[PDB]
């Protein structure tokens, strides 16, 4: 979270923290956590934490750790592809099933999901919040939670001049309609260590709640612009996954 301010865990009780893939997450209900596909890519069993202002090593031992049961990746993702996502990050979304339910309180409560109507269709002029322990301007690691307000920018401002030759320059990053562009204002953006964070947007119908409109996926030079996974396009897959893998 570059260009952002401090924020207690009460500002983002849905913000899950991930260890091996030092990344972010999003609680949606008592049994499932939403994150990016590349977050739980090479780690089929993440290390998750909730309800903590700080992620000091002295704090994670006294914070609630979630025990995952199974990791569900969206089928439109890459596979054994060597870390460099040179091909794409299309369908960069994943669901994590928890073995134990989550007791909700003042520092842990889940965020809503985007509705299937057309009001939830993101566009210019809309605003959003990003929260994560990613890299700010000072250090690469944020011990206490940071947050910044980002507007939905046109995807034209995303396609930027960034080296895209991890291996064969022939491979070119493709931009899909399943991605949302944001940032630009005051240079506020999401950097390394924010993947899986929810792009919290206020519900247009119930203006007191919030819903995860995007998940921090990829982008060029951080601090400029980037790409968040459009969650509205995967609402049918999240529901078809939570109901099939019932809790018997």
């Amino acid at each position: 979270i570059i260009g952002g301010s401090d924020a207690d865990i009460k500002n983002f009780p849905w913000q899950v923290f991930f260890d091996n893939p030092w990344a972010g997450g999003a609680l949606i209900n008592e049994y499932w956590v939403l994150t990016a596909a590349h977050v739980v890519e090479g780690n089929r069993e993440p290390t998750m934490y909730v309800g903590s202002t700080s992620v000091q090593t002295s704090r994670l031992a006294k914070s609630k750790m979630l025990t995952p049961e199974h990791v569900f990746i969206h089928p439109g993702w890459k596979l054994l592809e060597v870390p460099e996502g040179r091909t794409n990050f299309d369908n960069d979304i994943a669901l994590v099933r928890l073995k134990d339910p989550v007791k909700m309180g003042p520092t842990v409560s889940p965020i809503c999901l985007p509705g299937t109507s057309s009001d939830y269709n993101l566009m210019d002029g809309d605003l959003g919040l990003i929260s994560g322990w990613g890299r700010t301007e000072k250090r690469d690691r944020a011990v206490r939670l940071k947050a910044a307000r980002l507007p939905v920018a046109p995807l034209r401002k995303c396609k930027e001049v960034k080296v895209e030759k991890p291996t064969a320059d022939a491979e070119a990053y493709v931009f899909t309609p399943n991605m949302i562009c944001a940032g630009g204002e005051k240079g506020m953006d999401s950097c390394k260590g924010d993947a899986g964070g929810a792009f919290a947007v206020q519900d247009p119908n119930d203006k007191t709640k919030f819903y995860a409109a995007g998940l921090v996926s990829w982008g060029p030079q951080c601090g400029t612009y980037g790409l968040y996974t459009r969650v509205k396009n995967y609402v049918d897959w999240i529901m078809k996954t939570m109901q099939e893998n019932s809790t018997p």
């Binding site: 590349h38 090479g42 290390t47 031992a61 996502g85 990613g134 895209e164 990053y173 260590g193 924010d194």
Partner: protein
């Protein structure tokens, strides 16, 4: 009765038992770890080489018989009639270390000729004789070790018995280093959790070091791998939270968990990781006879049956000592590879800042070369 000297195996038969040898070298390592922890204090560093140890035990198993031949096979997790283990062990030798295995005997212990050559061929060393007075035998052993170890292991023994008849020795140091050099300018004093306080130890640092890692649930620990030279690699197992003591991680390591983790690391790709860990510099001298009794092996002090080596009826192991001098600092091979550009908005990290367990692994023949723990980097 004594079973005759063992028969030489063919190159394909011995190459066929490579998968058999690599599996018993894992079961035997775990038995040595539980023994070493039961002998040292509760929170002490230790480093032992389970490979060089078994290389000398099978050198003994060559001339054993009756109960001594079977107990050595059950201690070393060997199958019966495993006649190709001697040649298979010689082939497992890695150039990343420099180890020695000698057997010293008093002048009144006659060595059979069927073993003088069988030890000089299958292990390149015949039994060496000792002097007459015990005073010269002490310095004769330490100098022979200080000569054939490039002056690394100087004081392998602190004392020798007056009635010394049978001495087993093995000293090994690590000459291999990292395949990727560490920057010494980035060596910052980072905190390190010790006991319950926070001590500061010298720690190496690298923003994009190639580390293949993941999480294992059976251990509740982060398992990372680092690439050395000579087809060697150092595996490091750190508990996830501080809630899990290293002791709880020790009691959870089974032969199944071991083999289920090394086979998952052989198929996990090395990725540019941000890494921070203290220097590894552990030396451990240990009376190995105390280890044999800690594994319910009471043959070296009672009812010793070594007919293939000697025909002496009254024979017992007078001493047996091991020393491992493992050291790894900011020295490496390929300075760096760079080539970074990951556009993903995530962070990859592996951090060893608490008591941990390390295993130096040989990826080629698949077996643990070294094995130990570090409770205090100081």
């Amino acid at each position: 009765f004594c079973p005759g000297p063992v028969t030489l195996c063919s190159d394909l038969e011995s190459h066929s038992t490579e998968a058999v040898l690599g599996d018993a070298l894992v079961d035997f390592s775990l038995k040595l770890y539980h023994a070493f922890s039961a002998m040292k204090k509760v929170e002490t560093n230790m480093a032992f080489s389970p490979f060089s140890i078994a290389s000398l035990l099978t050198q003994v198993l060559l001339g054993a018989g009756e109960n001594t031949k079977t107990n050595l096979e059950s201690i070393l997790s060997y199958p019966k009639d495993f006649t190709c283990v001697h040649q298979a062990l010689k082939g497992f030798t890695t150039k990343g270390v420099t180890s020695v295995s000698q057997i010293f005997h008093s002048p009144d212990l006659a060595i059979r000729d069927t073993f003088v050559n069988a030890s000089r061929t299958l292990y390149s060393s015949s039994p060496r004789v000792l002097s007459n007075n015990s005073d010269a035998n002490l310095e004769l052993i330490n100098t022979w070790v200080a000569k054939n170890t490039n002056n690394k292991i100087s004081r392998l023994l602190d004392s020798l018995p007056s009635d010394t008849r049978l001495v087993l020795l093995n000293a090994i140091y690590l000459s291999a280093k990292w395949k990727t050099t560490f920057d010494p300018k980035k060596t910052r004093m980072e905190p390190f959790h010790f006991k319950n306080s926070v001590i500061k130890v010298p720690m190496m640092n690298s923003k994009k070091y190639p580390v293949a890692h993941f999480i294992d649930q059976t251990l509740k620990a982060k398992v990372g791998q680092l690439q050395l030279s000579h087809n060697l690699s150092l595996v490091i197992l750190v508990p996830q939270n501080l809630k899990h003591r290293l002791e709880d991680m020790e009691q959870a390591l089974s032969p199944s968990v071991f083999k289920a983790i090394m086979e998952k690391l052989e198929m996990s790709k090395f990725q540019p990781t941000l890494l921070t860990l203290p220097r590894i510099k552990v030396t451990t001298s240990q009376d190995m006879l105390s280890i044999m009794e800690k594994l319910e092996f009471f043959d070296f002090s009672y009812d010793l049956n070594l007919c293939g080596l000697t025909e002496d009826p009254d024979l017992q192991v007078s001493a047996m000592q091991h020393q491992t001098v493992l050291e790894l600092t900011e020295t490496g091979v390929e300075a760096a590879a760079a080539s970074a550009i990951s556009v993903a908005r995530t962070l990859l990290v592996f951090e060893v800042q608490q008591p941990f367990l390390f295993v130096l692994w040989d990826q080629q023949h698949k077996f643990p070369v070294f094995m130990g723990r570090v409770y205090d980097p100081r």
